[PDB]
């Protein structure tokens, strides 16, 4: 899977994270080492989101 959708709203509170809204589509570009964060791209740009806040489409 490469195309994902947000399960829950997540609000970025730092420079490298990416805010997402439930239902919003994102492209996932990888996981970090411990797996708790994914690198995502949406129409708002690119950054990290919780890996358990998204799911494949």
Numbering used by the authors: 63 to 119
Reproduce, without paraphrasing, sentences from the article in which this PDB structure was first reported.
The Src homology 3 (SH3) domain is a ∼60-residue modular domain that consists of two antiparallel β-sheets orthogonally packed to form a single hydrophobic core. This domain is present in many proteins and regulates critical cellular pathways by recognizing polyproline-rich motifs (PRMs; Kurochkina & Guha, 2013). Three-dimensional domain swapping (3D-DS) is a mechanism by which some proteins can oligomerize by exchanging identical domains or structural elements between monomers. In previous work, the 3D-DS of the c-Src SH3 domain has been characterized and its dependence on experimental conditions has been described.
However, the interchange of one or two loops within the Abl SH3 domain produces a noticeable reduction in its stability but does not promote the formation of 3D domain-swapped oligomers. In this way, the ΔG values are the same for the WT and Abl_Src-RT, but the Abl_Src-nSrc and Abl_Src-2 chimeras show a noticeable loss of stability. Similar to the results from chemical denaturation, these data point to lower stability in those chimeras where the n-Src loop was exchanged, whereas the RT loop has a minimal effect on stability. Although the conformation is slightly different in the RT loop, the hydrogen bonds are conserved. In the n-Src loop, there are significant differences between the WT protein and Abl_Src-nSrc, but also with the Abl_Src-RT and Abl_Src-2 chimeras. However, Src_Abl-nSrc shows an ordered distal loop in most of the molecules in the asymmetric unit and this chimera does not form the intertwined dimer. The same behaviour can be observed in the Abl_Src chimeras, where the distal loop shows low B factors. Indeed, even though the Abl_Src chimeras are less stable, this reduction in stability does not allow formation of the intertwined dimer.
